[PDB]
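Q: Structure for this?
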Amino acid sequence: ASVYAWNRKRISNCVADYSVLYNSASFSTFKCYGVSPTKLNDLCFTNVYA
Amino acid sequence: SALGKLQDVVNQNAQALNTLVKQLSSNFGAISSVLNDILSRLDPPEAEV
């Protein structure tokens, strides 16, 4: 989507996989706030907004 | 209420202890008041600050 119409998806009721994102290393910017990018995102969340 | 002094002393001690217990769960400017949640979520430099 374009920036003004920022598209939002809700990640709900599924077993998340964050390891593949971290280990991919093709994503230039890997800045994580609150949760750390150093293999700690493997947790549980009530709601993920993408 | 004929023993108001002893009751007052006990109430003040209980109030101070309860206030300390309540203050245990204050953010103090941090992201969370639970230490374990901070440790299991955040990287060691930011976790330690």
